[PDB]
Amino acid sequence: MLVANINGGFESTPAGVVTDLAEGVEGWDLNVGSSVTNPPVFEVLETSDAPEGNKVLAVTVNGVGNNPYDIHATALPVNVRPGVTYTYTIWARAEQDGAVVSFTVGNQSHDDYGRLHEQQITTEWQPFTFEFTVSDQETVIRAPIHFGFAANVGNTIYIDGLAIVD
């Protein structure tokens, strides 16, 4: 496929705990909000339990901040053409039931093109998919995934297989 995002399945990244949140995982920016006082752990896992390849990203939430994006994994850059309609697809599961995640796509002004908001994540892998249109003149966009929900404290969420395709 003609994919707009880079390293969507983490297959380019060495397994281990991420200590470089900005540049340790090619094609993604991980960050933690200054309001989060019990920080999360991000880890690339090498596993047979992957929907794609053998790597997944595991996000362990230990506490939250003020905003759901205060614990996030954002695909960036996401290279796109104005006016085009894309299909976003990703897989996610959690260690315990009751996890909540938002899968968004938006521009550098932090306006969304679309999202799957506050999705219930279960202990089995499930696909989350939506279409969105680049409705402005942007060519470099981003795909923020929000993990900072109280529901997630004590849980680990696993993501894999992000594809943003024409």
50 binds Ca ion (CB under 5 A): yes
Q: Cα–Cα distance between 111 and 133 in angstroms, integer?
A: 13
4 is in an annotated binding site: no
Contacts of 32 (CB under 8 A, 6+ apart): 21, 39, 40, 65, 70, 71
Per-residue contact string for residues 4-43; x = within reach of Ca ion by CB under 5 A = -----x-------------x-----x--------------
Structure tokens at 121: 């994540």
Q: What are phi and psi of 151, to 5 degrees?
A: -55, -30
26 is in an annotated binding site: no
118 is in an annotated binding site: no
Per-residue contact string for residues 106-145; x = within reach of Ca ion by CB under 5 A = ----------------------------------------
Contact indicator for 71, 36 with CB cutoff of 8 Å: yes
For Ca ion, the closer of residues 77 and 98 by Cβ is 77
Candidates 49-57, 96-104, 119-127, 132-140: pick the segment binding Ca ion (CB under 5 A). Answer: 49-57
| Cis? peptide before 77, omega within 30° of 0 | yes
Candidates 32-40, 55-63, 64-72, 103-111: pick the segment binding Ca ion (CB under 5 A). Answer: 55-63
Whole-number Cα distances in Å, 159 to 19, 79, 150:
18, 21, 18
Residue 83: CB minimum distance to Ca ion, A: 26
Structure tokens at 90: 């990703």
95 binds Ca ion (CB under 5 A): no
- Contacts to Ca ion by CB under 5 A: 9, 23, 29, 50, 52-53, 55, 160
